[PDB]
Amino acid sequence: CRFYQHKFPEVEDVVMVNVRSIAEMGAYVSLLEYNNIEGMILLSELSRRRIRSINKLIRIGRNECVVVIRVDKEKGYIDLSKRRVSPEE
Amino acid sequence: KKVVDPFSKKDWYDVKAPAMFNIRNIGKTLVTRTQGTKIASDGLKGRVFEVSLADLQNDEVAFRKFKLITEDVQGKNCLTNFHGMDLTRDKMCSMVKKWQTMIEAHVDVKTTDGYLLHLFCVGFTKKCNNQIRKTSYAQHQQVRQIRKKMMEIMTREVQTNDLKEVVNKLIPDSIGKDIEKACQSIYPLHDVFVRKVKMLKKPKFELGKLMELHG
Amino acid sequence: TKKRRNNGRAKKGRGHVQPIRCTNCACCVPKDKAIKKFVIRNIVEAAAVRDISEVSVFDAYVLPKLYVKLHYCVSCAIHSKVVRNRSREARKDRTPPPR
Amino acid sequence: SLGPQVAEGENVFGVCHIFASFNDTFVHVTDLSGKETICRVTGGMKVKADRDESSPYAAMLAAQDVAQRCKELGITALHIKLRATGGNRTKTPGPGAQSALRALARSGMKIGRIEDVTPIPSDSTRRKGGRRGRRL
Amino acid sequence: TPDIKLFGKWSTDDVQINDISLQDYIAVKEKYAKYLPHSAGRYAAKRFRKAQCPIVERLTNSMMMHGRNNGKKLMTVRIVKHAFEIIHLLTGENPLQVLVNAIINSGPREDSTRIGRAGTVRRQAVDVSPLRRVNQAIWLLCTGAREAAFRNIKTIAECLADELINAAKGSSNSYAIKKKDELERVAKSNR
Amino acid sequence: RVQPIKLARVTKVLGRTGSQGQCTQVRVEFMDDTSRSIIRNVKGPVREGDVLTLLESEREARRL
Amino acid sequence: RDKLNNLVLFDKATYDKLCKEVPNYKLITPAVVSERLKIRGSLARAALQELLSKGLIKLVSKHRAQVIYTRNTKG
Amino acid sequence: SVTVRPDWVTIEEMDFPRLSKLTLPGVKEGEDVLCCGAVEYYDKSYDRVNVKNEKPLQRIDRIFHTVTTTDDPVIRKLSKTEGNVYATDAILATIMCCTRSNYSWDIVIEKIGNKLFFDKRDNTEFDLLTVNETSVEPPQDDGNSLNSPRNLALEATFINHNFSQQVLKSNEPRYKFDEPNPFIGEVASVAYRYRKWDLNNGITLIARCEHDAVMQGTQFLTIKALNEWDSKLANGVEWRRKLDTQRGAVLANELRNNACKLAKWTVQALLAGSDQLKFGYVSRASVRDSSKHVILETQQYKPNEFATQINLNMDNAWGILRCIIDICMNQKDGKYLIMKDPNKPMIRLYDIPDNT
C-alpha cells in the first residue's frame, strides 16, 4: 500500500502523483506517496503562462509534483495545483 | 512568514468633535496600547482625523471632509481640534465644467488663534437670465477682479473669527455669498466655494480652548 | 491631397500647441489634434448598487459621481473604436454622438 | 482588543482605504485617522494568481474576510473609500471594486457614507513611455 | 386502466418526483401514463417534443447509440424492461421511481460555459436548463450502461440498473453521479 | 466567500448570447425576496419561468 | 484490452457457496453469480437451475440472452 | 385588518427574521383524536382538462364552514379530552406561514384557563384568499375596480369554494370516517380531522384539519384553486397559450407573486395529511370579467412533493408555533390578537378585551 500511516493527502498537500494515462480534460494521475490514489489536473488551473506546447520526446509515465486543492475522501477525486506553486519546486 | 495578534493590544479612543459640532463623539478607534513596550501616543494625539461633516455636525451635508488633529486625548476620548475642511472630489469636480470661467483663490491666512491656515477656493459663472450664449465668460479683466475680492474676503474672515469660528462660518460659505453679492453689480457669480483648507501652523496652547471647543 | 480637412481637429488661431499622450497607449499626439472625452460616471455603478444601497444605512446622501477627462491617441482611438472609420462625406461632420 | 463597548448594536466607523488598482485590489481598513490599519488583505492575498489579483471574484474573497474581521473587531460600519491608482498614473480602479463592495454589503458591514478618494495632479512630473510607446 | 394507466410491469403511480427545477420534465404518471414507451417513433419534430417525451421513453431512445446498436429499440425496450426488474430485486422500490430519482441526482445545478480571460482559461458560472439537467442526467446514465457491459458478464440491463440505483441515491458507482460533479466543479471554479 | 444555494426562478429570458448566440441571458428574479432581481446566463436552451438553482449570485453572469 | 476468465469448470466450492450465499441473493442473474463466485456465467445458469430445483430461488426472467432468478418469494 | 384599539395591551413583537431563525426538530405527527365529516370521491376524468380543452368553473350551491375554535363545538368537545392549544388549519397555516404574509391578518388567542383557544373573529379578512401579496407590484387598483386587492381576494375565495366542490363527485356517496359533519347535501362535502401534536416544550396541540376529497387510487386529497384574472396586469406569465413544456414553470410564476397563500395551502394539507395535494388552474373567461371562470388544468401533486418544491421548513414552522404558544400560554387570559402589520413584515401579540 504505502508507508504513510495516513491514507489520503490533505489540503494544500504537495504530492507526487504518477501520470498513468492522459484523459479527456487532463490525466487521472495516481499518488504514490499515498498508495495508488487517483487525482486530477486541468481544465482549470495547473499552468501559469502561455507558450503553447507540452511535449517533444516525453512519452508516458511521468510524475507531477502537484498541490492538492480539493480532495474527496469519500468520492475519490483529488484536485491538484501547479499554478499556485511559486515555492513548491 | 510573520503574523501577530495585535488585537489583544489595541485600546478604543472615542474620537470627539468639538461641541460646536452637535455630534461630538465621531467614532472610536482601536489605537494600539500606548505604553512603554508599545508607544502609540503619537499615533493617538498626532492623529489627524479626516472626517466628513455628516458624522460631525449631524448632517447638513455628507461631503466637506474636515481634518481633525487631536489636540488632546483625555481619558480614552480623542478630543479633536480642527485642522482642514474639504469639498471632496465628487462634490468638487461636479462644479468643474467646460464653457465657464473657473475662478480660483488661494490664500494663506493666520487665524485669530495661533493657527496659520491656507484656504484655496473655487468659483464659477452662470448662464444668466436672458443669456443665449452657450458659454459664460467675460473679459479677463473681470476674471482678475473677481479673484481679488475672493482673496480679500477670505483673508478677512479668517484673520478674524478664531479657528473654531472659521469652522462656524464656512459650511454655508459665509465668505462665499458676499463675493457673489459685491460682484453682482458686475457679475452675479454662480459659484464661490472654498475647498482646500490646510493648517500651516499648529501650536498647542489652546488646551483650555480645546476644553472650550469641547464639553 | 488632404484626406482630412481639420486633420483630426483644427489648429487655427494657434500657431503651435501642447502635445498629449494616450490615456491607454501613452502615444504623443497634440492637444487639439487628439480625441478628448469627459466621463461623468457613478462611483457606485449598477453592479453593486442593488446591494450597496440596501446596506447603505444612515445614508440618505445621493449617489456620488466620478469625473474623468480622457484623452486618446488616434491609433488607440481607432482600434479600440473610440473613433472609427466613417465615410468621407461623414468625415465633414464635426458632430459628437450623444451620451 | 475586542470591540469598543460592543461588537454589534452600534456603528463604530472604520474607513475603507480600498486601493483598488490594476493587478491587485487592496482592501485595507484603517482607524479614522488612517495611521492604524487593520486587515492587511490584498485582492491577491486570497488568490495569489499574479493576473487575477485585481479580478472581481478574488476581491469578493478579499473584502468579505476584511468585512468578517471588521465586524469581529467592533467596527460595524464603513465609510467607503474606494481609491483608484491615483496620482499622475493610470488612476483607474480595477474590476475588483464593484463586486467586492457588493460582497462586503452581502457580508454585513454597514455603509454610512460614500465619497471619492482618487488623487489627480495638476499635470505634474513626467510619464513612463517614450514618444512611440506601444504602437498600434 | 381508464382510472389509472401504469407501466408495463410496474406502476407509474407511487413515483416521487423530488427535484426543484425538474418538474414537468420528469413525468410518468402526470400525462405520460404509459405501459409502452413509444410515442410515434420521432422525438425531434419540435423543441417542444423533448418535454413531451417522458424520461422513461427517452431512456429507450437515448440508449440505442453505437451504430451496431442503433436502429434497435426492440432490443432496447427488452433490455430496459429487463433493467427495471434488476432494480427491484436489488431495491424493492418502484424501478420507475428509482429511475425517476436517478434523473434527480444526475441533473446538475450550475455548470460552466466557455469564456476568455487574458489568454487564460476561465469559465462562466452559469445554470443549465432543467431540460438540459434532464438531458445531462439521461446521457450520463446511458453512457455507463453499455460501457460497463461491453467486456463483462453483465448485460446492459444489469449495468443500467446499477446505473439507476447508484444515481437514484448518489453512490458514485454509477457513471452519472461521477460526471455530473465534474460539470458542477467548474462553476464554483475558474473566475 | 461562501453563501447558500439560492432558488431564483426565471422571470424573463433576456436573450440568447455568447459567441454563437447560445448563452441564454436570463432575468432570474430571486423568487424569495421580490425586490431582488439578479441577472445570470444559461448554457442550455430555456423557455421561461423554470426555477434555476443558483449556487451563487456572486461572479455575476452578465453579457458576453 | 480486457482479459478475464472465470472458472470454466462446474465448481462445487462455488456452488456450495452459491447454496449458502443464497440469503444475500435476491437479484440473481448468472452474471451476478459468475461475479459473486468464480463460476463461468454459462455454468452459473445450470447451477442456478439446480438452485431453482432446490426451490430456494425462483425465475423472474428467462430471456435467451440471460435469465434472472430470485430467492424466496419476496425475500 | 382592524383598528388597534387603545385597550389592546401590546405584548411582544415577533419579527419575521426572528421567526425565520427558530427551529424545533423532532415533532410528532398528528395522532387522530377525532375524524368527523363527509368527503365525496374524486372524478378522475377531470384530468381531461388541459390547455386546449378547458372546463367552466361551476358554482356549487353548498354550505361552507370555516368555523373558529371558540365556535367549533367539537374542538370544544375535545377541549376536555386532550390538548392545551386549540386551533384550526386556516389559523395554524396563517401562523406557520406568517413570515410570508404582507397583508394584515389577525388571530384571537383567547386564553381561557390553561388553554389557548386560537380563535378567529367571525367574518373578518382572514379566511379570504389574498391575491399577489408578495409581487413586485400588487394590484394597486381601488376597491371599486375588479382589479383591486379585495375584489380579487373575494374572487379567489369565490373560485376555490366553487372549484373544490366541483372536482368532487358531487352526487356520489361520501367517505365518512367516523362521524358526519357536526355543523349540520346542503353542506359542502368536507370532513374534519382533529389531531394531536406534542410540541416539545410540552404543548399538546389539537387543531381542526380538513380533507377536500378522497380519490380511488383510496387517496385523501387537498384541492385548491389558482386564479388568473389578467396576467398582463398581474405581472406573471399568460397561462393558456403554452402551459406544457414550462408546465411547472407557469406554476413557478405564481410562487413568488403568491408566497403566503400557497404556502398556507401547503400547511393545511400537511396539517390534515392528504395523500395527493392537488391544485387547479382556473382563469377568467375574459380578463376583465371576474365572475365567468374556466378551469384550465386540475394539476395533481403529492403533499410531500409539493412541500418539496416551493418554500417550506417545518422545524421553523413548529418553532414559530413553539414561540407563539409559549408567549400566549404565559400571558393574560381572555381574547388576544396576534396581528400582522399591513405594511411591515412583523407580527405582534396584543391583549384585547373579550368584548372585541
Q: Which residues pair with B94 in a beta bridge?
A: none
Q: How far apart are CA H298 and CA H296, in angstroms?
A: 7
Cβ–Cβ under 8 Å, residues H87 and H69: yes
Q: How far apart are CA H12 and CA H338, in angstroms?
A: 9
Cβ–Cβ under 8 Å, residues B69 and B100: no
Gap from C6 CA to chain D (nearest CA, Å): 23
Could you identify the residue written with the cell 504537495? A14
Query: Which of C40-51 are b and which e, b meaning 16 or more Cβ less than 10 Å from the residue's Cβ?
Result: eeebbeebbbbb
* C-alpha torsion sign, points C86, C87, C92, C95: negative
Q: List C-alpha distances in Å: H233 to E110, F33, H136, H228, H288.
A: 33, 20, 12, 10, 10
Contact F/H (≥3 CB pairs under 8 Å): yes
CA angle E18, E24, E25 (to 5 degrees): 90
Domain positions in chain E are 1-191
Question: Which grid coordinates belong to D70?
Answer: 471588521
Q: How far apart are CA B136 and CA H353, in angstroms?
A: 73
Please report residues of B whose CB lies closer than 8 A to that of C66: 89-90
Q: How far apart are CA B86 and CA B51, in angstroms?
A: 10
Cβ contact D57–F58 (<8 Å): yes
Chain B adjacent subunits, 3+ CB pairs under 8 A: C, D
Gap from B142 CA to chain D (nearest CA, Å): 24
* Residue H261 identity (one-letter amino acid): K
The answer for residues whose C-beta is within 8 angstroms of residue H168's C-beta and 6 or more apart is H39, H40, H41, H42, H43, H189, H212, H213
Least Cα distance to E14 among E38, E36, E33 occurs for E33
Tell me the H-state helices in chain H.
16-20, 73-81, 89-96, 149-166, 248-252, 260-272, 303-309, 314-328
Least Cα distance to H59 among H295, H303, H233, H310 occurs for H295
Cβ contact E153–G2 (<8 Å): no
The domain total for chain D is 1
> CB distance from D101 to chain C under 8 Å?
yes
The residue range of the domain holding D124 is 1-136
* Residue B11 identity (one-letter amino acid): D
Please report residues of E whose CB lies closer than 8 A to that of D57: 191
* C-alpha torsion sign, points H270, H274, H277, H282: negative
Contact G/C (≥3 CB pairs under 8 Å): no
Please report residues of D whose CB lies closer than 8 A to that of A86: 48
Q: How far apart are CA C44 and CA C41, in angstroms?
A: 9
Note which residues in 275-314 of chain H have CB less than 8 A from chain F: 311
CA angle A77, A78, A83 (to 5 degrees): 140
The answer for residues whose C-beta is within 8 angstroms of residue G57's C-beta and 6 or more apart is G22, G25, G28, G48, G51, G69, G70, G71, G72
Cβ–Cβ under 8 Å, residues D17 and F19: no
Q: How far apart are CA D71 and CA D77, in angstroms?
A: 8
Q: How far apart are CA H269 and CA H304, in angstroms?
A: 9
Note which residues in 85-114 of chain E have CB less than 8 A from chain G: 85-86, 89-90
Q: How many Cβ contacts (< 8 angstroms) between chains C and F? A: 4
Residues across chain F:
64
Q: Tell which of F59, F62, F64 to mutate to test the E interface (max E CBs under 10 Å).
A: F59
Question: Which grid coordinates belong to H143?
Answer: 376597491
Burial of H81 (0-12, 13-18, 19+ CB in 10 A): exposed
Kindly state the DSSP code that residue D96 receives in the 8-state scheme.
Answer: G
Tell me the H-state helices in D28-75.
43-46, 56-72
Please report residues of A whose CB lies closer than 8 A to that of D49: 83
> CB distance from F59 to chain D under 8 Å?
yes
How far from chain centre, in Å, is Cα C37? 2
Gap from H263 CA to chain F (nearest CA, Å): 12
CATH number at residue D87: 3.30.420.80
> CB distance from B62 to chain D under 8 Å?
yes
Question: Which grid coordinates belong to G21?
Answer: 450465499
Q: How far apart are CA E13 and CA H300, in angstroms?
A: 12
Least Cα distance to H27 among H169, H157, H202, H185 occurs for H202
Gap from C65 CA to chain B (nearest CA, Å): 5
Q: How far apart are CA E129 and CA F46, in angstroms?
A: 5
A66 assigned to some structural domain: yes
Q: List C-alpha distances in Å: H291 to E82, H131, H146.
A: 53, 16, 10
Cβ contact H217–E24 (<8 Å): no
E strands present in chain H: 9-15, 31-40, 55-56, 85-87, 106-111, 116-119, 174-176, 191-198, 204-211, 213-215, 219-228, 276-284, 293-301, 336-340, 346-351
Please report residues of F whose CB lies closer than 8 A to that of E112: 43
CA angle B207, B208, B214 (to 5 degrees): 85
Please report residues of B whose CB lies closer than 8 A to that of C63: none
State which residue of chain B sits closest to C37, comparing Cα positions. Answer: B98
Q: Which residues pair with D114 in a beta bridge?
A: D80
Q: How far apart are CA B42 and CA B34, in angstroms?
A: 9
Q: List C-alpha distances in Å: H303 to D61, H266, H279.
A: 41, 7, 11
Could you identify the residue written with the cell 411547472? H248
Find the helix or strand (DSSP H, E) in which E103 lies.
helix E95-104
Note which residues in 38-97 of chain C have CB less than 8 A from chain F: 47, 50
How far from chain centre, in Å, is Cα F29? 8
Cβ–Cβ under 8 Å, residues H293 and H127: no
Q: How far apart are CA H41 and CA H172, in angstroms?
A: 7
Coil/strand/helix, residue E19:
coil
Q: List C-alpha distances in Å: E89 to D76, E6, G36, H247.
A: 60, 19, 16, 34
Q: How far apart are CA B79 and CA B81, in angstroms?
A: 7
Helix axes E175-188, E130-149, angle to 10 degrees: 140
* Residue C26 identity (one-letter amino acid): A
Q: List C-alpha distances in Å: H339 to B58, D43, H2, H6, H7.
A: 36, 48, 9, 15, 15
> CB distance from G30 to chain E under 8 Å?
yes
Please report residues of B whose CB lies closer than 8 A to that of D83: none
> CB distance from D74 to chain B under 8 Å?
yes
Cβ contact E124–F61 (<8 Å): yes
| Number of neighbours of residue G41 by Cβ within 10 angstroms | 20
CATH number at residue A25: 2.40.50.140
> CB distance from E171 to chain A under 8 Å?
no
Cβ–Cβ under 8 Å, residues B168 and B148: no
Q: How far apart are CA C32 and CA C74, in angstroms?
A: 12
Cβ contact D98–C47 (<8 Å): yes
Which of B54, B90, B98 faces C64 most closely, judged by CB atoms?
Answer: B90
Cβ–Cβ under 8 Å, residues B32 and B38: yes
Which of D34, D73, D113 faces B30 most closely, judged by CB atoms?
Answer: D73
Could you identify the residue written with the cell 397583508? H103
Please report residues of D whose CB lies closer than 8 A to that of C55: 105-106, 108-111
The residue range of the domain holding G56 is 1-75
Coil/strand/helix, residue E126:
strand
Question: Which grid coordinates belong to F8?
Answer: 431564483
Residues across chain G:
75
* Residue B98 identity (one-letter amino acid): K
Q: Strands across the sheet with H106-111, in order?
A: H9-15, H346-351, H336-340, H106-111, H116-119, H85-87, H204-211, H191-198, H31-40, H174-176
Coil/strand/helix, residue D70:
helix
Least Cα distance to B58 among B15, B25, B82, B23 occurs for B23
Q: Which residues pair with D62 in a beta bridge?
A: none
Burial of E47 (0-12, 13-18, 19+ CB in 10 A): exposed
Coil/strand/helix, residue A63:
strand
Q: How far apart are CA B162 and CA B116, in angstroms?
A: 11
Least Cα distance to B55 among B8, B21, B78, B93 occurs for B21
Half-sphere exposure of D14 (CA within 13 A, CB side): 32
CATH class of residue range C1-99: alpha beta
Cβ contact C67–B94 (<8 Å): yes
A24 assigned to some structural domain: yes
Burial of D93 (0-12, 13-18, 19+ CB in 10 A): buried
Cβ contact F60–D61 (<8 Å): no
Number of helices and strands (H, E) in chain F?
A: 0, 4
Question: Which grid coordinates belong to H215?
Answer: 380519490
